[PDB]
């Protein structure tokens, strides 16, 4: 079996959060079903009705040190925007990558990213980057290139 986990976008801030549970559903004649979500590590008061098609998706993957090669210019990623009054995961696109040899601490690469919601730009390390799960494909391809 392979586990499938989800993240949901909050209407409060436009950031994405891990989903702990789906509590209820509601339907409209106009379409676009909504689901009531309990967010991981937040509890009942933060519960939200979420557009299933638009704002629920398979969870983004925090990157392993070796997986920086699957983070490419042009990609949408889920990026940790760490400020002083808030620190939240936002969609961003990778503009450029500065790839450097790894050391004892792992990946030393740096990524220039542009957040989708405000067009602001930031240089971030791999530890702030979450991969969309389909990029597993890339890694799989790479894995097939190894020696038997």
């Amino acid at each position: 079996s392979v586990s499938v986990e989800f993240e949901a976008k909050s209407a409060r801030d436009g950031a994405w959060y891990d989903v702990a549970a789906f509590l209820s559903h509601r339907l409209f004649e106009s379409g676009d079903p909504e689901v009531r979500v309990r967010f991981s590590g937040f509890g009942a008061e933060e519960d939200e009705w979420i557009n299933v098609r638009k704002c629920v998706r398979q969870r983004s993957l925090p990157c392993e040190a070796t997986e920086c090669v699957a983070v490419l210019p042009g990609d949408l990623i889920l990026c940790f925007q760490e400020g002083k009054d808030q620190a939240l995961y936002y969609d961003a696109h990778v503009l450029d990558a500065q790839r450097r040899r790894h050391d004892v601490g792992g990946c030393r690469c740096r990524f220039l990213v542009r957040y989708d919601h405000d067009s602001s730009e930031e240089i971030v390390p791999l530890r702030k980057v979450c991969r969309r799960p389909e990029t597993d494909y890339r890694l799989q391809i790479l894995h097939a290139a190894r020696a038997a």
Binding site: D13, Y17, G41, E82, Q86, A87, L88, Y89
Partner: peptide, 9 residues
Amino acid sequence: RTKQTARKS
């Protein structure tokens, strides 16, 4: 694996 802890507002 594990995400960083979000802090709202």
